[PDB]
Design a protein around this ligand. Structure first.
Ligand SMILES: NC(=O)C1=CN([C@@H]2O[C@H](COP(=O)(O)OP(=O)(O)OC[C@H]3O[C@@H](n4cnc5c(N)ncnc54)[C@H](O)[C@@H]3O)[C@@H](O)[C@H]2O)C=CC1
Ligand SMILES: NC(=O)C1=CN([C@@H]2O[C@H](COP(=O)(O)OP(=O)(O)OC[C@H]3O[C@@H](n4cnc5c(N)ncnc54)[C@H](O)[C@@H]3O)[C@@H](O)[C@H]2O)C=CC1
Ligand SMILES: O=c1ccn([C@@H]2O[C@H](COP(=O)(O)OP(=O)(O)O[C@H]3O[C@H](CO)[C@@H](O)[C@H](O)[C@H]3O)[C@@H](O)[C@H]2O)c(=O)[nH]1
Ligand SMILES: O=c1ccn([C@@H]2O[C@H](COP(=O)(O)OP(=O)(O)O[C@H]3O[C@H](CO)[C@@H](O)[C@H](O)[C@H]3O)[C@@H](O)[C@H]2O)c(=O)[nH]1
Ligand SMILES: C[N+](C)(C)C
Ligand SMILES: C[N+](C)(C)C
Ligand SMILES: C[N+](C)(C)C
Ligand SMILES: [Mg+2]
Ligand SMILES: [Mg+2]
Lengths: 345, 346
């Protein structure tokens, strides 16, 4: 009746969201298998221990895989969840092209297993981590919720779109379900404290963490994936949104579920697009470092540009992304500088 | 021929017929099935397979198991050397799908993903998949060629088939070492000529033909025709009925194609000719010599007016075509029904 299950909560967006939830008086229970998150010293992952410290509130956590029915059943028997925020999954567009089965497995099969447990336990309130990739190659920009979905350019985007469809079907089959599908754009930045941030395990697939690792000196130079796109400078254009703003959108989503909203879909973006080179520039500026780069071939699955029309979320969720580029860059750099090796090494 | 061909859902309708064709064509099948929609034999083998053994004088290796059981699947791939996999296993009750979506996603999606993962792990990268004309969504033009748009399915069952195609297409695009033939079946009907095996619907049939045959035999009072106000010659739905034996043979063609290291290939398995509900009723009265009373009721949710294949690509590239006609299909269906009033058993 009270707890909020947060899958993949030790990750980038999840950790920030657990923070916001706690600050807002909610009671999160987090699960993660650490596939893409650093393991803390103690029971808690590093990221979560830090959130526990920043908020002053306990973080209930369990190490587990969403693909383990057993563990999930156990978890649901142990806690009385009121809702589920589902972040757990694989998220690299380019990797998906090469390892489709891993994506279908973790993203599709893992979500199906979670929905089955939820249904079984009567916890029919969900917030799902969707993505702008479900729009496939943009037919128009900015992207609104009315733009066609499907015809994705990569297996990851298909996996997200397929999940949206399953959810719509589930909601059609049972009107008692409420589900908010959040199509995020490109989150960046970090908690203002600089204590938590984006700390991928291994080499970063995302632009910004890679860029920050270059500025801090952990990486020699950034590889720019193509410069022959139909954009102002030829490099990819994305709608960067502060991870803090994005995290806050989850609280608004929780409120929407309480209205017995049914199945709803909202973009979570700023509406302002920035190119690869513009991001590098903003980061040189924030870090005071030179961010060497070189142009390589395009990365399969990538689109030239994508940015959101965030009006719907403002109208129905009463949410808007407050923070801008400067703030994103500044927050990112603060985290990087305070944590040159991320959470640990 | 020492390597084996794994046939999932092989105790079922299309699968059993396919197993028979594989044996006759010299392949060595290993069949798996969980009995979800197949009748348990008196012994270990499913009845359908027991009969296929007698009809061919050849043996069928069989293991009772669920594709969702990773442990059993992993053991299976250790036990045998497979050169290819023909994947028939799955749930197919469209109506139930609209009500139990997750069951459909679990069995069809998760089941396939597991199978593909185990195949990969053991170096088996040759697949034949049971797809369906439903992936084309509501027809935008007729006849339906492989290039007609896919997706936009109207029920979970259909969406699941489309999702599986996409996954396989993605796997093939990623890895040029994979070969996969996606077969879009249209409306399988008929039965093996011996009348020994056929479609054995569990409970009230959801498809037209078994409902028709069951009426003929008196197992059902009368046929309910789902609408007669469609934009068709007689107003009833039009479909491309294709003999299960021809369909089965298409799978042998598929194996041959895989041998060509064909990558991802997609072919319709239809005849190219559509027939209306009323036309099938008349053809069944002709074949059976029995009365088949009907009554026109409301349209059934999700039905399209007409659906039929463009069989050219299959003929030219898969090197296959349906040889059996309408009368043969009805005749064969009737023989099976007549000789087995209650389907399988003893
Ligand atoms: N970062 C981005 O730009 C975007 C992210 N998304 C989605 O948001 C979600 C969270 O993304 P991020 O926080 O950026 O990535 P992340 O990799 O930091 O977070 C995902 C978390 O899931 C965990 N995880 C992975 N597989 C798991 C499994 N089988 N069981 C349990 N935990 C598992 C990982 O260890 C990780 O902590 C994902 O679903 C992602 O696809 C969608 C759009 C934007
Ligand atoms: N009959 C038709 O009109 C069409 C059939 N298809 C597809 O062709 C395939 C075969 O169709 P049919 O022979 O008519 O159906 P069927 O139900 O007779 O055959 C499927 C077989 O799969 C087995 N099975 C189900 N779930 C299983 C699981 N989890 N593990 C192991 N075995 C399992 C069932 O027990 C059954 O013997 C299916 O994938 C179906 O969706 C596609 C188009 C048309
Ligand atoms: O080393 C790198 C990494 C990225 N890029 C480019 O930078 C941009 C952003 O790339 P990336 O951070 O990988 O983000 P996306 O591929 O746009 O996808 C992100 O944003 C999507 C929503 O827009 C989510 O679906 C994905 O999970 C999330 O990874 C693109 O134009 C990339 O080509 C480079 O040039 N070099
Ligand atoms: O009791 C019945 C059953 C069917 N019909 C009609 O007969 C036609 C055929 O219906 P049915 O046998 O259920 O076949 P389809 O709905 O066309 O679907 C079959 O063929 C599809 C591909 O064409 C596959 O996706 C399915 O799995 C398979 O069941 C349609 O016009 C129906 O409206 C009736 O009038 N009465
Ligand atoms: C029209 N667009 C392809 C430039 C978005
Ligand atoms: C006869 N065979 C080798 C083609 C199976
Ligand atoms: C194997 N094939 C040449 C008949 C396509
Ligand atoms: Mg390639
Ligand atoms: Mg009469």
């Amino acid at each position: 009746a009270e707890k909020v299950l947060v899958t993949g909560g030790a990750g980038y967006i999840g950790s920030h969201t657990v923070l916001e939830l706690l600050e807002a008086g909610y009671l999160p229970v987090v699960i993660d298998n650490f596939h893409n998150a650093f393991r803390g010293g103690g029971s808690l992952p590093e990221s979560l221990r830090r959130v526990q410290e920043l908020t002053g509130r306990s973080v209930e956590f369990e190490e587990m895989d969403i693909l383990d029915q057993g563990a999930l059943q156990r978890l649901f028997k142990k806690y009385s969840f009121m809702a589920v925020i589902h972040f757990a999954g694989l998220k690299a567009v380019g990797e998906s092209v090469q390892k489709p089965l891993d994506y279908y497995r973790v993203n599709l099969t893992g979500t199906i297993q979670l929905l089955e447990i939820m249904k079984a336990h009567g916890v029919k309130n969900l917030v799902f981590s969707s993505s702008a990739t479900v729009y496939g190659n943009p037919q128009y920009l900015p992207l609104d919720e009315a733009h066609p979905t499907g015809g994705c350019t990569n297996p990851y985007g298909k996996s997200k779109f397929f999940i949206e469809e399953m959810i719509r079907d589930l909601c059609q089959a049972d009107k008692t379900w409420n589900a908010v599908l959040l199509r995020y754009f490109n989150p960046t930045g970090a908690h203002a404290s600089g204590c938590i941030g984006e700390d991928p395990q291994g080499i970063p697939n995302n632009l910004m963490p890679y860029v920050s690792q270059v500025a801090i000196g952990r990486r020699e130079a950034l590889n720019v994936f193509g410069n022959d796109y139909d954009t102002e400078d030829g490099t990819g254009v994305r709608d960067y949104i502060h991870v803090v703003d994005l995290a806050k959108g989850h609280i608004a989503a929780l409120r929407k579920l309480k209205e017995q909203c049914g199945c709803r879909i909202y973009n979570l973006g700023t509406g302002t697009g920035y190119s690869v080179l513009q991001m590098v520039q903003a980061m040189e500026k924030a870090s005071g470092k030179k961010i060497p780069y070189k142009v390589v071939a395009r990365r399969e699955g990538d689109v030239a540009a994508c940015y959101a029309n965030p009006s719907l979320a403002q109208e129905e969720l009463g949410w808007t992304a407050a923070l801008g580029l400067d703030r994103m860059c500044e927050d990112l750099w603060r985290w990087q500088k305070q944590n040159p090796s991320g959470f640990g090494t």
